[PDB]
């Protein structure tokens, strides 16, 4: 007769009216009301309804399905919340409409689906439906992600030539990650597995196995879905030779030069790396000749009988493409010039795939971008014109570093700072840095423009403040508070090379100077004649230096090099008009000669030369003297203990205490000069080091390459050419370079989770008086 609803708070009344056949002015009986309620639940409009007995006409009660007002995720450690909210959206239930209890389990399995895809093959999910008035519910899914499926073992079958550990060492997938080593992660990925299969193929083709083939790759899960086993069933062939190389295809008239690229010596083992290098050399030769896409297919004809390989290098020099314009996308912060100056491919020139790759690699080397992609789009209405569009994803380039390290040389090294390497997107790198050793407190503020000239010349200024406590550096006590500015132009004259030349003003404040022969000789030669007493002296100099330098860096590997050489020749000569009048030349060198094809055995020749003297009427400052001993210069000795020793004058110390002797204080009973064992350094040093790097003896070969074991022998002598051997005859002649200290020992280096750890035990078998023989040297993460 007249239906009166009680619900319909959220759902429109008309939906219930059309979903309920019986209405006002209609026949009323049990069958009809049953049909109406059945059809009402058929559409699922209402979670619960009822008809309440009423003396007046008819009455209807309605309870709609509880609408969800918010989605709450907890415990989803391995994946972002909105990723699973997109899953909930894709299912068909989201905020703004009702919640279906039946769909809940489908949601639960859906979250299991993407935890399976990401690599968490066990991640339970529980639904929590918190009630809310006005017919609402808030889901609070409790995620309980199980143990991630880590690689329990990587096995190789048929690797009779090479052990499984040796082959897995190069794999980025790791089955063993020691706590003390940083070799990667045990997480398994499809792309990582494919990359490691390619790595295995490269490794086997680099050793002469042209017939090497990966028969199968079994990826198995432990029945708990916690461990993953990778079995690379391979079939290595024999160590084939390289009989000859032929070239074919349209070489476009450059057959002579291409053949000049393809020299091989017969009877030499097939090398996949050499084959790829030859292919890339031909590609680069044709690209330099203007061919954008020089296809090169080096197919091997394999003679199993004679066990030789004949390379048919089919070469197709494609059409010449020209870059109409190079476009940069995503460089919202960095200006166009910053990205364009890193391009080797030039707009308006013929397209070069190698040039584009070099530009992309340089942009990736900038570090300003998360990822750099290149697209050689075809210009519409032009058969051979292209636009080389670069899509870059800008990074938060500014960062503040917080390093903590320990070592015998410098005690505790607290390094901190903040640097914005892309200041205002102009390419300028601004940055303040700070170091606190046991003896040195450095505060730097460097602003550098990497491209002061379009050719690549950099221009960098640096405001530095160095508080050097010589006493804590195992030297004669004196505090040198220096502050100044440097402006240096870096010249990239050649790749692997970089000169530098700059001007720098430095003001040095020397205090608490220990009275000694060398420092007083320098002070006398600087025109000041202060008394040998009054321990707390004071000296101030303002010195302008022309600094020059040359760094040759051919090291194939930045960390743990195996081949190449790094030479750093840095000189500093005082320009006229400065308080100090001296020159000082230093020369570092570290050459790595690999004596085996695997580069496991290396010979390291490390030299450290230095010579400095005044320019007439002045002497080299005592705080600029070279030092040897300690880690990285002459292992087995104390830090800066090699060289001339201070000869303290009879003087009165500021503070006195019996049984300390206060380095020849008058209160202790000293009236004549004394030989002290505290080193002061010398104006010249010469250090050499022959270091035989060997594979770590007792270690798994999977991470043997991550730990560098070495047997080192360091020669080193520091002498002061300005030593007055005439009026100081009883003391040893410190101007004698023949006193070449030598030490021999063993050293371990590896990138522990605490930074680069370097330990060493060395015996100095030829040391002189006053040389503190610290047998054990070490340095925990100097970075």
């Amino acid at each position: 007769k007249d239906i009166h609803f009680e619900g319909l708070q959220r759902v429109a009344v008309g939906a219930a009216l059309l979903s309920m056949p019986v209405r006002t002015g209609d026949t009323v009986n049990d069958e009809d009301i049953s049909n109406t309620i059945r059809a009402l639940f058929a559409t699922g409009n209402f979670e619960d309804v009822c008809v309440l007995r009423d003396g007046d006409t008819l009455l209807v009660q309605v309870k709609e399905r509880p609408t969800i007002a918010s989605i709450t995720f907890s415990g989803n450690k391995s994946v972002k919340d909105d990723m699973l909210k997109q899953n909930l959206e894709a299912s068909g239930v989201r905020v703004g409409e009702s919640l279906d209890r039946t769909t809940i389990a489908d949601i639960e399995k859906g979250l299991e689906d993407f935890y399976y895809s990401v690599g968490k093959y066990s991640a339970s999910v529980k639904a929590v439906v918190t009630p809310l008035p006005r017919n609402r519910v808030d889901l609070k899914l409790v995620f309980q992600e199980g143990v991630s499926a880590e690689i329990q073992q990587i096995n190789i079958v048929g690797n009779h030539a090479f052990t499984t550990d040796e082959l897995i060492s190069h794999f980025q997938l790791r089955d063993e990650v020691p706590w003390w080593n940083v070799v990667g992660d045990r997480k398994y990925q499809k792309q990582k597995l494919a990359g490691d299969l390619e790595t295995l193929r490269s490794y086997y083709l680099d050793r002469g196995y042209a017939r090497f083939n990966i028969d199968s790759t079994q990826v198995s899960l432990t029945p708990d879905k916690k461990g993953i086993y990778v079995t690379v069933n391979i079939t290595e062939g024999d160590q084939y030779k390289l009989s000859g190389v032929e070239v074919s295809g349209n070489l476009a008239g450059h057959s002579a030069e291409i053949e000049q690229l393809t020299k091989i010596e017969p009877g030499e083992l097939y090398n996949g790396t050499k084959v790829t290098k030859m292919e890339d050399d031909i590609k680069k030769l044709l690209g330099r000749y203007g061919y954008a896409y020089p296809r090169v297919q080096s197919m091997p004809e394999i003679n199993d009988a004679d066990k030789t390989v004949k390379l048919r290098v089919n070469v197709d020099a494609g059409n010449r493409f020209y870059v109409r314009k190079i476009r940069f996308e995503g460089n919202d912060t960095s200006k166009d010039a910053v990205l364009r100056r890193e391009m080797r491919q030039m707009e308006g020139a013929w397209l070069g795939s190698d040039l584009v790759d070099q530009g992309k690699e340089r942009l990736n080397r900038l570090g300003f971008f998360e990822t750099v992609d290149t697209d050689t789009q075809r210009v519409p209405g032009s058969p051979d014109q292209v636009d080389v569009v670069y899509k870059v994803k800008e990074r938060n380039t500014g960062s503040f570093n917080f390093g903590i390290g320990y070592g015998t040389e410098s005690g505790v090294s607290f390094q901190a700072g903040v640097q914005q390497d892309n200041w205002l997107g102009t390419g300028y790198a601004v940055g303040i840095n700070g170091t606190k050793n046991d003896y040195q407190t450095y505060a730097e503020l460097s602003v550098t423009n990497p491209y002061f000239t379009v050719d690549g010349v950099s221009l960098g200024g640096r405001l530095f403040y160095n508080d050097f406590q010589a006493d804590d550096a195992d030297l004669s006590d004196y505090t040198n508070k220096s502050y100044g500015t440097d402006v240096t132009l870096g010249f990239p004259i050649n790749e692997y090379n970089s000169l530098r030349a700059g001007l720098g003003y430095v003001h040095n404040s020397l205090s608490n100077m220990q009275p000694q022969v060398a420092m007083w000789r320098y002070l006398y030669s600087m025109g000041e004649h202060p008394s040998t007493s009054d321990q707390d002296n004071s000296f101030k100099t303002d010195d302008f230096t022309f600094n020059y330098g040359w760094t040759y860096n051919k090291l194939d590997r930045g960390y743990f090099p195996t081949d190449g050489s790094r030479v750093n020749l840095t000189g500093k000569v005082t320009i006229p008009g400065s308080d100090n009048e001296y020159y000082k030349v230093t020369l570092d060198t570290a050459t790595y000669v690999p004596i085996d094809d695997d580069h496991k055995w290396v010979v390291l020749g490390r030299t450290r030369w230095g010579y400095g003297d005044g320019l007439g009427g002045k002497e080299m400052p005592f705080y600029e003297n070279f030092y040897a001993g300690g880690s990285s210069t002459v292992r087995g000795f104390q830090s800066n203990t090699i060289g001339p020793k201070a000869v303290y004058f009879p003087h009165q110390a500021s503070n006195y205490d019996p049984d300390y002797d206060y380095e020849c204080a008058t209160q202790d009973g000293a009236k004549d000069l004394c030989k002290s064992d505290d080193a002061v350094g010398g104006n010249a040093m010469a250090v050499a080091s022959l270091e035989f790097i060997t594979p770590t003896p007792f270690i798994s070969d999977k991470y043997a390459n991550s730990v560098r074991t070495s047997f080192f022998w360091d020669m080193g002598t520091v002498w002061d050419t300005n030593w007055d051997s005439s009026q100081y005859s009883g003391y040893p002649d410190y101007s004698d370079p023949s006193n070449i200290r030598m030490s021999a020992g063993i050293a371990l280096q590896w990138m522990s989770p605490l930074g680069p750890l370097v330990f060493s035990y060395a015996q100095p078998f030829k040391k002189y008086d006053g040389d503190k023989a610290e047998q054990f040297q070490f340095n925990i993460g100097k970075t």
């Binding site: 500014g398 390093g403 903040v418 605490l754 993460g781 970075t783």
Partner: peptide
């Protein structure tokens, strides 16, 4: 140890 944080 060395820490660096991208802000």
């Amino acid at each position: 140890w060395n820490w660096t944080k991208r802000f």
